[PDB]
Amino acid sequence: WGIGHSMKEILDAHVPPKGRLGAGHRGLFETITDSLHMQLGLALASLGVATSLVAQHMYALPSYAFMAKDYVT
Amino acid sequence: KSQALPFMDAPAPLDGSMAGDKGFDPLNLSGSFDIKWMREAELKHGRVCMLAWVGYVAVDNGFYVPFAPHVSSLAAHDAAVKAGPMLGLLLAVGAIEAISYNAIAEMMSGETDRRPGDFYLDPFNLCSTPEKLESMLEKEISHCRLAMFAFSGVVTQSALTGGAFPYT
Amino acid sequence: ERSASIPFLKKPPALDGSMVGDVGFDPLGISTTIIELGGDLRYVREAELMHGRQAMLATVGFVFPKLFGKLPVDWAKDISLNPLEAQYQIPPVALGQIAISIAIAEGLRSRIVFSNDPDYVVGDHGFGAGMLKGKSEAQVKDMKMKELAHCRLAMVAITGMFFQTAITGSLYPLVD
Amino acid sequence: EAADTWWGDKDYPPSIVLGIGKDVPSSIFGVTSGLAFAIGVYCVAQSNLVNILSGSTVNGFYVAGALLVPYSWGLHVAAWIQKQNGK
Ligand code: CLA
Ligand SMILES: CCCCCC(=O)OC\C(C=C=C1C(C)(C)C[C@H](OC(C)=O)C[C@@]1(C)O)=C/C=C/C(C)=C/C=C/C=C(C)/C=C/C=C(\C)C(=O)C[C@@]12O[C@]1(C)C[C@@H](O)CC2(C)C
Ligand SMILES: CCCCCC(=O)OC\C(C=C=C1C(C)(C)C[C@H](OC(C)=O)C[C@@]1(C)O)=C/C=C/C(C)=C/C=C/C=C(C)/C=C/C=C(\C)C(=O)C[C@@]12O[C@]1(C)C[C@@H](O)CC2(C)C
Numbered sequence: 252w253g254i255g256h257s258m259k260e261i262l263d264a265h266v267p268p269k270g271r272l273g274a275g276h277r278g279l280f281e282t283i284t285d286s287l288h289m290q291l292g293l294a295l296a297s298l299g300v301a302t303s304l305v306a307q308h309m310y311a312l313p314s315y316a317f318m319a320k321d322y323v324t
Numbered sequence: 325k326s327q328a329l330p331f332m333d334a335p336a337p338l339d340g341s342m343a344g345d346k347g348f349d350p351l352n353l354s355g356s357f358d359i360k361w362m363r364e365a366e367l368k369h370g371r372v373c374m375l376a377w378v379g380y381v382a383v384d385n386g387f388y389v390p391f392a393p394h395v396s397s398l399a400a401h402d403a404a405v406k407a408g409p410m411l412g413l414l415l416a417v418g419a420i421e422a423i424s425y426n427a428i429a430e431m432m433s434g435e436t437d438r439r440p441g442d443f444y445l446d447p448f449n450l451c452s453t454p455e456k457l458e459s460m461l462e463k464e465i466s467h468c469r470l471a472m473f474a475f476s477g478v479v480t481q482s483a484l485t486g487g488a489f490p491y492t
Numbered sequence: 493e494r495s496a497s498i499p500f501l502k503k504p505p506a507l508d509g510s511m512v513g514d515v516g517f518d519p520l521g522i523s524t525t526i527i528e529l530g531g532d533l534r535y536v537r538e539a540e541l542m543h544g545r546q547a548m549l550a551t552v553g554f555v556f557p558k559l560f561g562k563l564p565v566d567w568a569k570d571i572s573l574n575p576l577e578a579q580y581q582i583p584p585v586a587l588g589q590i591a592i593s594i595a596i597a598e599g600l601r602s603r604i605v606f607s608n609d610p611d612y613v614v615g616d617h618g619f620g621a622g623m624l625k626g627k628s629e630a631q632v633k634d635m636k637m638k639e640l641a642h643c644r645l646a647m648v649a650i651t652g653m654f655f656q657t658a659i660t661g662s663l664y665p666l667v668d
Numbered sequence: 669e670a671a672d673t674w675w676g677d678k679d680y681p682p683s684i685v686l687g688i689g690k691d692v693p694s695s696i697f698g699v700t701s702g703l704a705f706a707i708g709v710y711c712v713a714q715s716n717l718v719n720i721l722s723g724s725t726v727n728g729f730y731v732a733g734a735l736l737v738p739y740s741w742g743l744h745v746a747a748w749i750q751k752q753n754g755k
């Protein structure tokens with residue numbers, strides 16, 4: 252419906268002005284879509300951060316009633 | 325070459341051919357953004373203002389439908405929201421505006437030659453010849469511009485005064 | 493170019509005619525995203541057809557127990573009004589037969605639909621053939637168009653009936 | 669597909685990076701950037717000058733105006749982009 256971003260243009264635009272990061276993120280859109288190993292690697296990295304976060308926050312801030320007293324769960 | 329502001333020339337060349345063109349755009353928003361969206365918004369605002377002025381007058385006179393507790397048009401909004409059918413009217417308007425989402429999205433980016441605010445709700449062929457279409461477009465847009473001020477004044481006078489039909 | 497239903501919208505490129513009820517009504521473009529997957533419109537037409545047929549049988553079944561009466565057999569102490577609340581008083585020793593009959597019918601229909609065969613006219617299950625012999629293509633097309641119109645009307649109708657009896661007490665012009 | 673948006677061989681991005689606002693001149697962008705920044709800072713200051721309460725003092729207009737502070741960042745960046753482009 253016309254509105255919205257194109258992910259290719261966002262990646263191709265993000266080049267620092269004078270060669271600080273090389274050619275920027277040009278060509279990253281074609282590599283990610285055509286490689287299922289890069290998408291899967293990003294997914295596993297994010298999910299690993301997420302489940303470590305749930306490990307920290309479920310003992311730090313318990314949400315289920317009458318836990319933090321069983322101690323074994 | 326501007327008409328309304330004779331010390332200027334054409335606030336971008338966007339103002340060259342459409343109906344109701346008087347060169348009046350001092351803040352250059354005609355050239356900053358695409359003018360089809362502006363004309364769609366203008367026509368849509370004017371049509372809303374026309375029906376809103378017609379409804380605000382008629383409810384303030386005594387035209388009341390079955391049920392619909394007889395209250396002035398100032399409190400009719402709250403009375404009918406507490407009654408309920410305002411939500412159904414909102415749902416119907418939302419369906420029409422989903423179709424309007426589709427229409428405006430098709431109009432702006434190629435693949436459809438729709439005029440801004442066009443639709444095709446023309447049962448009686450009052451715009452068959454192009455000259456009749458131009459005349460009716462001029463009358464429509466002039467009525468839009470007049471009815472915006474008309475309904476704005478009606479609402480403001482009804483809100484600040486106690487309330488009558490001529491609004492003092 | 494432009495659709496025959498919504499005149500200010502573009503014509504759906506998948507809905508190019510040659511099908512019953514093709515008035516070019518697809519603002520979301522469901523059929524556009526079905527054929528670019530390499531599929532066709534046989535399955536969605538079959539779904540619409542039996543949705544409408546169940547809708548017609550439903551429209552008769554909402555109104556029949558209260559407008560006319562119940563079965564002469566026993567155990568019919570279910571509420572005459574509120575069919576949606578009369579679902580839960582059905583004894584299991586009738587639900588078993590209902591479920592078995594629908595199960596075998598839909599197993600046969602699943603064998604028909606999901607097979608592969610290209611000679612299968614959509615909706616032509618073979619149950620109804622006693623009246624279409626000796627008819628031209630125009631008569632069959634008109635008959636299928638009447639079926640599709642009744643399908644869509646009955647689906648809108650049953651949505652109305654279910655949303656009326658659940659919020660309001662009952663249907664206004666016929667009940668209570 | 670899309671448009672050639674890469675500008676690694678130029679000192680400024682092209683005007684097409686602004687999308688729907690690719691034709692707005694730089695002066696409008698800068699004036700709206702200053703106005704949006706001022707209004708947004710005022711709206712977020714109405715949450716610490718006055719203690720925001722549980723429902724009593726929330727004032728959703730100040731919430732909607734609070735989104736102008738990140739919007740003011742994008743407007744002054746787009747002002748620079750249009751200025752280098754000559755628009
Ligand atoms: C007087 C104001 C006015 C004028 C001159 C026009 C003129 C035009 N409109 Mg338009 N329109 C108006 C108001 C007006 N409109 C309003 C208020 C709405 C909102 C509903 C619309 C919605 C609208 C749509 C959706 C479409 C048009 C179209 C058109 C064009 C062809 C139709 C035509 O000849 O209409 C001539 C108009 C008249 C002779 C006016 C008759 C006066 C009526 C009878 C008054 C009725 C008031 C009544 C109380 C309202 C009840 C509300 C209730 C039923 C909901 C033409 C340029 C069509 C178009 O551009 O396609 C080519 C099109 O698709 N208009
Ligand atoms: C056992 C055989 C099958 C029997 C079942 C049956 O029925 O047959 C199927 C059949 C054809 C057939 C065949 C037979 C010839 C019969 C037998 C053949 O078999 C052989 C071997 O020959 C098979 C077949 C298929 O060829 C034909 C049946 C057609 C049928 C049953 C069509 C009903 C539409 C209802 C509608 C549109 C409701 C609208 C309701 C509307 C529009 C409303 O507005 C209602 C509502 O306003 C109300 C009233 C009040 C409001 O408050 C609420 C609302 C607003 C909602
Ligand atoms: C009317 C005012 C007049 C003065 C202002 C002004 O116009 O100057 C404009 C100007 C310079 C200039 C001019 C030109 C345009 C070049 C030319 C002009 O001449 C013409 C017309 O050509 C003259 C001149 C000097 O004006 C420069 C503008 C610079 C500007 C506007 C810089 C904004 C940064 C924003 C940031 C860093 C946001 C951080 C935002 C943050 C950190 C957040 O969002 C936090 C957040 O919690 C928030 C707050 C809300 C939450 O929801 C979201 C979260 C939680 C994330």
Ligand code: KC2
Nearest residue numbers: 648649650651652653655656657659660661662663664665
């Ligand atoms: C989205 C779901 C939905 C659909 C698809 C749908 C379709 C139709 C159709 C077309 C087939 C017709 C012809 C029709 C007609 C009437 N409907 Mg709908 N209707 C739906 C929902 C509701 C709800 C929630 C209510 C309601 C009612 C009425 C009344 C009563 C007016 C009166 O009493 O005079 C009448 C005449 C109200 C009612 O039950 O009585 C208060 C009520 O609350 N309807 N309705």
Ligand SMILES: CC1=C(C#C/C(C)=C/C=C/C(C)=C/C=C/C=C(C)/C=C/C=C(C)/C=C/[C@@]23O[C@]2(C)C[C@@H](O)CC3(C)C)C(C)(C)C[C@H](O)C1
Nearest residue numbers: 518519520521522543546547550553554575576578579647
């Ligand atoms: C097509 C299209 C669109 C669309 C659409 C729409 C509106 C689609 C709607 C489809 C719809 C509405 C499909 C209903 C099915 C309901 C059925 C089959 C109910 C059967 C009901 C049964 C079998 C009930 C039987 C009962 O026995 C029970 C349970 C108890 C008894 O006491 C009473 C009775 C006998 C009654 C978009 C999205 C608008 C745009 C897009 O681009 C194109």
